[PDB]
Amino acid sequence: SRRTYTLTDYLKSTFRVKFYTLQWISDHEYLYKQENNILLFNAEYGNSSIFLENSTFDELGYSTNDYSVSPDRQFILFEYNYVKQWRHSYTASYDIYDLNKRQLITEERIPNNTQWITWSPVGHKLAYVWNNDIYVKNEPNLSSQRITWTGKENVIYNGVTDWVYEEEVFSAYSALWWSPNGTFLAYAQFNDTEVPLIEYSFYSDESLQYPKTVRIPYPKAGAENPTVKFFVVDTRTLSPNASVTSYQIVPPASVLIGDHYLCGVTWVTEERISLQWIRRAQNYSIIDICDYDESTGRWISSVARQHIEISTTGWVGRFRPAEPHFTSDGNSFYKIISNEEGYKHICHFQTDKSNCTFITKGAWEVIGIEALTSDYLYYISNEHKGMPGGRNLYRIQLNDYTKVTCLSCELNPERCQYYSASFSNKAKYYQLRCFGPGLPLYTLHSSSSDKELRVLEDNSALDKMLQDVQMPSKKLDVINLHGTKFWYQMILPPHFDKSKKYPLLIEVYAGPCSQKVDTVFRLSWATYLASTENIIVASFDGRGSGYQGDKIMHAINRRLGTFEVEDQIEATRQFSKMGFVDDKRIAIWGWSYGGYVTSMVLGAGSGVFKCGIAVAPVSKWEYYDSVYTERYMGLPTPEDNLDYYRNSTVMSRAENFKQVEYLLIHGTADDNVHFQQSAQLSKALVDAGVDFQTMWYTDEDHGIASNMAHQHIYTHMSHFLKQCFSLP
Amino acid sequence: SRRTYTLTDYLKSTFRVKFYTLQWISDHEYLYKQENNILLFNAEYGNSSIFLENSTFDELGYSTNDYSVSPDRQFILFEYNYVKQWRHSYTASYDIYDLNKRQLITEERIPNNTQWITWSPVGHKLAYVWNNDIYVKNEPNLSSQRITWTGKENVIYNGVTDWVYEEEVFSAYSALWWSPNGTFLAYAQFNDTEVPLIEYSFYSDESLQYPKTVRIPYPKAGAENPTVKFFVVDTRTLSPNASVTSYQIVPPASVLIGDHYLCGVTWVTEERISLQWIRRAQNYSIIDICDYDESTGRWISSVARQHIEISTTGWVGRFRPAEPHFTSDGNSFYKIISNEEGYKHICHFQTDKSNCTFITKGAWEVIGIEALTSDYLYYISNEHKGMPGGRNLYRIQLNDYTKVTCLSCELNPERCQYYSASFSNKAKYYQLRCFGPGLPLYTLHSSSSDKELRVLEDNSALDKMLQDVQMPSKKLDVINLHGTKFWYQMILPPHFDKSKKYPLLIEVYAGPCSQKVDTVFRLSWATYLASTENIIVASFDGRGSGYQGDKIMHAINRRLGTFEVEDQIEATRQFSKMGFVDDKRIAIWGWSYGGYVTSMVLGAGSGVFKCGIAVAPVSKWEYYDSVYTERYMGLPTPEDNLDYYRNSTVMSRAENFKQVEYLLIHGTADDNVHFQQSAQLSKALVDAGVDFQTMWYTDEDHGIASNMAHQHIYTHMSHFLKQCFSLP
Ligand SMILES: *[C@@H]1O[C@H](CO)[C@@H](O[C@@H]2O[C@H](CO)[C@@H](O[C@@H]3O[C@H](CO)[C@@H](O)[C@H](O)[C@@H]3O)[C@H](O)[C@H]2NC(C)=O)[C@H](O)[C@H]1NC(C)=O
Ligand SMILES: *[C@@H]1O[C@H](CO)[C@@H](O[C@@H]2O[C@H](CO)[C@@H](O)[C@H](O)[C@H]2NC(C)=O)[C@H](O)[C@H]1NC(C)=O
Ligand SMILES: *[C@@H]1O[C@H](CO)[C@@H](O[C@@H]2O[C@H](CO)[C@@H](O)[C@H](O)[C@H]2NC(C)=O)[C@H](O)[C@H]1NC(C)=O
Ligand SMILES: *[C@@H]1O[C@H](CO)[C@@H](O[C@@H]2O[C@H](CO)[C@@H](O)[C@H](O)[C@H]2NC(C)=O)[C@H](O)[C@H]1NC(C)=O
Ligand SMILES: *[C@@H]1O[C@H](CO)[C@@H](O)[C@H](O)[C@H]1NC(C)=O
Ligand SMILES: *[C@@H]1O[C@H](CO)[C@@H](O)[C@H](O)[C@H]1NC(C)=O
Ligand SMILES: *[C@@H]1O[C@H](CO)[C@@H](O)[C@H](O)[C@H]1NC(C)=O
Ligand SMILES: *[C@@H]1O[C@H](CO)[C@@H](O)[C@H](O)[C@H]1NC(C)=O
Ligand SMILES: *[C@@H]1O[C@H](CO)[C@@H](O)[C@H](O)[C@H]1NC(C)=O
Ligand SMILES: *[C@@H]1O[C@H](CO)[C@@H](O)[C@H](O)[C@H]1NC(C)=O
Ligand SMILES: *[C@@H]1O[C@H](CO)[C@@H](O)[C@H](O)[C@H]1NC(C)=O
Ligand SMILES: *[C@@H]1O[C@H](CO)[C@@H](O)[C@H](O)[C@H]1NC(C)=O
Ligand SMILES: *S(=O)(=O)c1ccc(CCN)cc1
Ligand SMILES: *S(=O)(=O)c1ccc(CCN)cc1
């Protein structure tokens, strides 16, 4: 009998996966929210005490969306009235609560509609952005000091990013960086004066008689980009009747000569800051390490302290160049860069010398550097078992790079093959986060002995619940395409009968450096499709995919829509020969870059796919943003790459859609992949005489994530697939 | 014969319906284009002569889409470079050709992008609107003289209407009226300064990197309306060094008192003009007959020359008050108004008296007055056979209202029951245009004895072609609803088998004064559904429908979405009882008001309809324009009709859509029923967890009329209906 995992199970999150979020606040203590109380845990012995009782929240009078405790632990910030903006940005109201006198501060309160706020790294100073300008509050009860006066809606942004820097460069809204001891406050200023505006209708509540027009400075491929300025403010002199003491640091001449982006800021010491810049082409970046000159207040650059990173086969880094990890003294740093074999590994650099020494090597890649001490460097890589979709924490001895230990590989080999980690200050302890293939497992460890101190969350509750349900299994393996081994995964229906022929849904992402095949545990729409509807859902990482070296990743350089699309077709062709696949019922779907590939695949005329669903797809590269698009395609000009921009549109393949059943879905308020992309695509299909189906989602953005829209789109897509597969 | 009328036949117009368009230019002559050239036909003898040979058309720029010969026959305007704007408005380029010299006017050319142009009634003066300002040219070869200087895009309109006046008041773009002998040029000025703008994206050709935002001053229900000023210009003094001599005529005090509209302008003599105004509420209108005062140049009104028309049960007229038809001397006029019984009939008014005398009466209505001479009045009515969906031409003797003769009733009784007419200058001759129920037939008659004279176009070619196709048959009949007889029509599949149970499609309009049931012959989508897919298509005119008296038409006053919706359900229930109808397969569809009613019907939870399709439906009256909406609903305020605005939205019935399969279609560039309406409806259905289908049409307007979109929508709707009806 047994219950299966149903669409409703997926949509209502009936089977809850638990996690354990902690905030390290010292080298051996972390804050954790439990039953709405804020508890202070001591790692040394496992004991804890109440840091803030939940009664305090009952007393506030508003739904508290989040909180942040001052480093000296004297104050806590309460965030409420949360209003989402783009992928990372939002605005909110904030109250500061005095933990000593356990009273709420009511004098000189933080303004409503605040865009960003952060405590200094030590003490309890605050810096925040409001109306695009920066403000600094030395004391929670004292008036704040305005730092910038140029902030202007849709034009000048001080301390927060504009749309494209938020989405494609920083992957954050914040653009301010306090120095380690709070002496200086660095910030970036973005100028969008010349950037064209994307405009679209937002309908709002039914009572709004006239729709509003949203306007966002958004540079599409080849358009005018925002400019940026970087400043370091000496906060020691801030005073109501004092001017602001600040110094502008410009990029090195090799980047200054043309359009560029600021892509990284790293404080090294109180008097040394590292700036990472990249040319608009994105195959040339430079790290500039500037020293504070105490006699003049300026920040000095030197050719000796500059480090260039380039790429001859594609772009630099995965989505941006990797960040440098400096030693405490700041005289050298470690950073992931492509080695001579095209694999991303850790290189050790001396701050004032240009050559580096690789400390890791092999046909696998380091994902990120997690922590560094005078004696060891901790990092995550997919070296274990040589599987690119796995992740483990390793520790390397700095005085002898040949001494490397895998700290997580053998803890729970069958249950845990994909880890992330979080270290306390000075890396004395670490939380290990196991995400699959079994149920997520959160544990705490001691770095001095590498003993597991305790299990923080093991998902025993979920485990129980799932025993009564017929869950599908997820299998990973490899296939060969053009002489290269590539990975795939299949979510297989319960009681999988190798004998029977099942319909097959290809779920696709496939963007540059994408990784859709991994050992992560997920309760997804695919889980329901396999468990209840008996559909095999497969994914494949082909050319252009990441974490397998530049030869694979850079294969689609300057030619998006070619090899990654062809590989999905070839992989599927091989899947359709495995014997348990009903070749009469093969579909493909994807969101975003996956919607573009899904559409390009359906437009290929391969005869492999009966139907497909594209959600919020890119349809023509000139419609997407400059930073992302140009990174992989260059400029849409005849002198550069216009030809490949032109024959990589989905519209160019309209005629082939006559042989397939297609469902095109898009939110009308998508600020990222504009509804325009699907509107131009449908128009080309209508012009070619192609019948297909559509579904717009009013006022939904790129995530089509409102609670009702989320339920609606998956329900609608389930119906479409089941009709395509003749499933009742 | 064994083939049917196919979707391709409909979409590609394989079967051509011919017509005969002529332009009367004297009391006995008309111009007609034959094989690209213009011929001058003599009605009397039937002999023609070349007036303007073909080939003379040097495809100037593009092609001549229309011509106009000056009254004195000395010149001819060629219209080309046609660029559509809204329903009636468009811009074009014009060339003037001298018929005497047989030369093209090469100097002082009409501007490119001219909004409206017209010859004076006599002679050959020209008046035209360009960039929202009026210009007059006394001679084709002479420079034009500017009349207004206030023209401003989206703000001030001189000589042409703004959006709402074009669509809802004048049903025309022109707002210029020459006096009978060309002395005066009257015009209206519209001021949209305070009218809110509807804004929506227009994507344009795929090459446009950023979408455009269209903005149109459009007053939704209850919003600030445009204001109007009416002027009469004395063209005798127009000179480059002279100012403009003009006089502004304001409405009578009883209308000037509040928001109002100018709804009619009729020149009576060279010194008398008739203005018809209506209050914003549209239940009070007044005709003001002003006389020119030769000593001061003023146009004077007098209470004795004012005629009031009001409605206590609804609005005035069908869509606006009917126009007065003055006698040659201007001392009296004839106008259609509602009877004591609520039937629209012709009343004879004395220009300076308040009481009028009805010259027609009966349980039927006069549709319009076509021509007037000193002895007779010709009008069109649906008196014949008591079928309101029929139309015939009548003549009534002015000195004896007992003498009324039907001129078209008996010409071809079985083939022709729906006519319109076009009379020569002194009503000496008239063209009769038969539109059905048989193939259209155009004929020429003489008024003297009403002799048939000749057949202009009989469609014998279409007839020959159709004998080989299995055509469906159209039948009209009546059903009794709550004591009243209402008409319906059914398009029945060929070789109809009474033993079979046919699926049924209700095609609905149902707006106030609508008439969906008539004896007009049409080759439509329904012809195809019945001929090829064996689907019966029916239509019904219930409460709120027109041409059957005010009791039926005003039934839905201040309550749109109630009785007309309920009557479609009740009528369908009766049809469902017929043994040859499969009551388990009934669908309903409509466009515009019909989309609204289709949606309201589907949301009624009646259990009668399995599925339906709404194309560009109104979904909430507060989103539609002020003139149309308020005419039937009053104001959306608590003191007036807010309660009925609130419970007549489609969104209020969202829950009930869970019982049906619904397809919602809308053009994103719809300037009339804004995409907003469907965007808000879809969001409410999503919010209620209801599944349905949608189809947006990029850049299509209210008619979804471009060649490829037209084919695509009907093809898509056909597949949706076949799927709903389980038809192969
Ligand atoms: C404020 O803090 C108190 C703790 O002092 C919260 O009380 C605790 O509430 C949790 C949540 O319901 C209780 O846990 C439950 O325990 C049973 C164990 O059998 C388990 O079945 C549930 O799944 C859950 O784990 C906990 O026992 C209880 N502890 C105390 C001290 O009574 C209280 O909920 C907080 N108030 C608010 C408004 O959050
Ligand atoms: C755009 O056009 C290029 C050049 O014609 C395409 O690249 C070729 O693709 C074919 C078919 O797969 C290969 O056999 C050739 O080797 C390729 N030539 C080159 C110069 O690369 C490219 O696939 C097209 N892009 C898209 C999205 O269709
Ligand atoms: C169009 O109508 C507007 C009013 O809606 C007129 O604007 C007013 O003009 C007067 C005189 O110049 C000012 O005193 C008012 O302040 C204006 N109203 C506002 C708030 O705009 C405008 O003059 C009219 N245009 C024409 C040519 O008639
Ligand atoms: C809006 O509400 C009015 C008032 O309740 C509705 O009118 C009633 O309709 C019912 C039919 O179910 C009749 O039995 C009553 O006689 C009506 N009462 C009145 C005051 O006329 C009206 O139908 C509703 N409109 C819509 C669109 O649902
Ligand atoms: C844990 O216990 C130690 C002593 O054993 C004590 O110093 C520490 O403060 C305790 N931590 C908390 C906050 O529970
Ligand atoms: C922003 O850039 C524009 C040029 O694109 C310049 O004119 C303006 O002064 C700049 N504003 C600031 C505050 O730098
Ligand atoms: C700053 O100047 C203002 C006068 O403009 C004065 O009220 C205040 O006392 C001054 N504060 C300081 C820092 O001296
Ligand atoms: C970086 O890209 C630019 C523009 O496409 C190109 O001219 C340059 O050679 C590239 N640099 C390298 C080292 O590949
Ligand atoms: C012009 O008229 C002649 C007959 O008078 C006709 O044969 C010819 O086709 C016409 N030219 C065209 C095609 O416009
Ligand atoms: C028709 O013929 C008559 C003579 O019988 C002639 O006077 C008239 O001008 C002709 N009409 C035309 C323009 O063909
Ligand atoms: C009108 O004004 C123009 C100014 O250039 C002048 O040349 C012309 O003579 C005037 N008209 C007359 C003749 O009064
Ligand atoms: C005309 O309509 C208004 C409301 O829009 C109303 O107050 C008035 O009574 C109506 N007049 C007549 C004659 O019904
Ligand atoms: S992918 O999932 O690695 C991914 C997601 C989002 C982005 C930002 C592009 N706008 C890039 C890559
Ligand atoms: S109906 O066909 O009598 C009809 C058609 C168009 C309108 C204008 C609505 N804006 C009204 C009625």
- Shared domain check, B700 and B569: yes
Written as six digits, the tokens of B665 are 């279609």
Q: Confirm if A534 and A502 have CB atoms less than 8 A apart.
A: yes
CA nearest neighbour of A113 among A130, A88, A133, A134: A130
Last residue of a domain, one of B454, B470, B486: B470
A446 and A476 in one domain?
A: no
Annotate A593-622 with three-state secondary structure.
HHHHHHHHHHCCCCCCCCEEEEECCCCCHH
3-state class (DSSP) for residue B641: coil
Q: Rounded distance, CA B502 to CA A475, Å?
A: 52
User: Which tokens hold the place of A582?
Assistant: 């009903």
Please count the structural domains in chain B. Answer: 2
User: Residue with structure tokens 């008192």?
Assistant: B257
What would the two tokens of residue B568 be?
């479609």
What is the Cα–Cα distance from B372 to B398, expressed in whole angstroms? 9
Take residue A79 and report the two structure tokens written for it. 């965030």
**Displacement of CA B499 from its chain's centroid (Å):** 42
> Cβ atoms within 10 A of the Cβ of A450, count?
11
Are A445 and A582 found together in one domain?
no
677-706 in A: which are within 8 Å (CB) of B? 679-680, 682-684, 686-687, 689, 691, 693-699
Q: Which two structure tokens, joined as six digits, stand for A580?
A: 């348990």
Least distant ligand from the CA of B648: 4
Q: Whose CA is nearest to atom 3 of ligand 3?
A: B193
CB contact under 8 Å between B668 and A683, yes or no, is no
User: Entry resolution in angstroms?
Assistant: 2.0
Q: Max CA-CA distance within chain A?
A: 82
- What does the DSSP 8-state code read for residue A328? T
d(CA A129, CA A139): 16
Task: Tell whether A431 and A502 lie within a shared domain.
Answer: no
Domain that holds residue B152: 1-470
Residue type, B698: T
Query: How is residue B384 written in tokens?
Result: 């014949």
Burial letters for B586-604: b for 16+ Cβ neighbours within 10 Å, e otherwise?
Answer: bbbbbbbbbbbbbbbbbbb
Residue B455, SS3?
strand
CA torsion through residues A330, A334, A339, A342, sign: negative
Q: Is B446 on the interface with A (CB under 8 A)?
A: no
| CATH number of the structural domain spanning residue B225 | 2.140.10.30
B297 and B360 assigned to the same domain:
yes
Phi/psi region, residue B206 (left: phi>0; alpha: psi -120 to 50; beta: rest), is: alpha
Asked if residue A149 has its Cβ within 6 Å of ligand 6, the reply is no
Tell me if residue A129 falls in helix, strand or coil: strand
**In contact, B673 and B616? CB cutoff 8 Å:** yes
A694–B694 C-beta distance less than 8 A: yes
B180-198 in b/e form (b: 16+ CB < 10 A) is: bebbbbbbbbbbbeebeeb
Q: Which of A403, A445, A443, A407 is nearest to A428 (CA)?
A: A445
Atom of ligand 4 nearest to the CA of B648: 27
Q: Are residues B367 and B487 in the same domain?
A: no
The residue whose CB lies within 8 Å of the most ligand 2 atoms, and thus the one to mutate among A647, A653, A655, A656, is A647
Among A330, A138, A134, smallest CA distance to A233 is for: A134
- Judge if A402 and A432 occupy the same domain: yes
- Give me the residues paired with residue B15 across strands: none
Task: Answer yes or no: do A277 and A342 share one domain.
Answer: yes
Q: What is the number of residues in chain A?
A: 728
Q: Measuring CA to CA, how many Å separate B116 from each of A162, A725, B92, B135, B199?
A: 47, 57, 8, 10, 25
| Angle at CA of residue B127, ends B124 and B133, nearest 5° | 165
Whole-number Å distance between alpha carbons of A144 and A515 = 45
The reply to whether A710 belongs to the active site is no
Q: Which residues of B touch A209 (CB under 8 A)?
A: 220-221, 223, 622-623
CA dihedral B333, B338, B341, B347 (to 10 degrees): 0
In A, minimum Cα distance to B195 occurs at A210
- B353, two tokens: 């008296």
Burial A658-686 (b: 16+ CB within 10 A, else e): eebbbbbbbbbbbbbbbbbbbbbbbbbbb
Residue A143 has what DSSP assignment?
P
A140, A132, A58: which is closest to A97 by C-alpha? A140
Retrieve residue B281's tokens: 């509420």
| A687 shares a domain with A634 | yes
CA-closest candidate to residue B438, choices B414, B467, B460: B414
Query: Can you say how many angstroms the Cα of residue B432 is from the centroid of all Cα atoms in its chain?
Result: 20
B contact test, residue of A206, A650, A701 with most B CBs within 10 A: A206
Quote the distance between the C-alpha of residue B299 and its chain's center: 32
In this structure, are residues A590 and A598 in contact, taking their beta carbons and an 8 Å threshold?
A: yes
DSSP type of residue A570 = H
Pick from A201, A680, A693: which is nearest to B203 by CB? A680
Q: Compute CA A257 distance to the chain's CA centroid, rounded to the nearest angstrom.
A: 30
A209 touching chain B per CB within 8 A: yes
Last residue of a domain, one of B470, B490, B519: B470
List the residue whose alpha carbon is closest to atom 11 of ligand 11.
Answer: B241
Q: Which of A562, A564, A567, A655 to mutate to test the pocket of ligand 2 (most atoms within 8 A of CB)?
A: A562
C-alpha A247 – ligand 6 centre gap (Å) = 18
Q: Which residues of B are catalytic?
A: 592, 670, 702
Q: Are residues B448 and B487 in the same domain?
A: no
C-alpha distances (whole Å) from B700 to each of A407, A627, B613 are 61, 32, 18
Given B197, B203, B649, which is nearest A679 (Cβ)? B203
Rounded distance from Cα B37 to ligand 9 centre (Å): 7
Closest CA to B261 of B165, B132, B191, B336: B165
- The DSSP element (H or E) to which A419 belongs, if any, is strand A419-423
Q: Which residues contact A681 (CB under 8 A, 6 or more apart)?
A: A599, A617, A619, A620, A650, A651, A664
DSSP-assigned beta bridge partners for residue B666: B696
Q: What is the DSSP letter of A670?
A: -
What is the rounded CA–CA span in Å between residue A343 and residue A340?
Answer: 7
| Residues whose CB is less than 8 angstroms from the CB of residue A444 and which lie 6 or more positions away in sequence, other chains included | A43, A429, A430, A431, A432, A452, A453, A454, A456
Q: What are phi and psi of A92, to 5 degrees?
A: -165, 170
A511 vs A513: CA distance, rounded Å = 6
Q: What does the DSSP 8-state code read for residue B165?
A: I
Map residue A465 onto helix, strand or coil.
helix
What is the SS3 assignment for B582? strand
Residue ending a domain, choose from B419, B442, B470:
B470
Whole-number Å distance between alpha carbons of A288 and A274: 6
Cα separation, B684 vs B15, in Å, equals 43
Where does residue B501 rank: exposed (0-12), middle (13-18), buried (19+ CB within 10 A)? middle
Chain centroid to CA A407: 25
Which residue, among A18, A41, A19, has the nearest Cα to A28 in the 3D structure? A41
CATH of the domain at B690: 3.40.50.1820
Whose tokens are 């705490």? That residue is A444
Which residue type, as a one-letter code, is found at position B512?
Answer: P
Structural element, H or E, at residue A186: strand A184-191
List the determination method: X-ray
Together in a domain, B547 and B684: yes
Token pair listed for B569:
């359900």
SS3 call for B79: strand
Determine contact, residues A225/A280, Cβ cutoff 8 Å: yes
Q: Does residue A457 share a domain with residue A508?
A: no
Q: With contact defined as beta carbons under 8 Å apart, do A5 and A531 qualify?
A: yes
User: Nearest residue of A to residue B695 by CA position?
Assistant: A694
* DSSP class of A319: S
Q: Which of B22, B30, B31, B49 to mutate to test the pocket of ligand 10 (most atoms within 8 A of CB)?
A: B49
Cα–Cα distance, B134 to A642 (Å, whole number): 47
Question: What are the angstrom distances between the C-alpha of A710 and each of A335, A526, A707?
Answer: 40, 15, 5
Please check whether residue A400 is in contact with residue A376, taking contact to mean a CB–CB distance below 8 angstroms: no
Is the distance from CB of A491 to CB of A520 less than 8 angstroms?
Answer: no
Locate breaks in chain A with C to N over 2.5 A; list the residue preceding each: none
Active-site annotation holder among A9, A291, A625, A670: A670
What is the token pair recorded at B608? 């009668």
Q: Which of A628, A596, A633 is nearest to A508 (CA)?
A: A596
CA atoms of B66 and A540, how far apart (whole Å): 61
Strands (E), B570-676: 581-591, 611-615, 661-667
Question: Over A10-46, what HEC string results?
Answer: HHCCCCCCCCCCEEECCCCEEEEEECCEEEEEECCCC
Task: Identify which of A696, A711, A712 has the shortest CB distance to residue B696.
Answer: A696
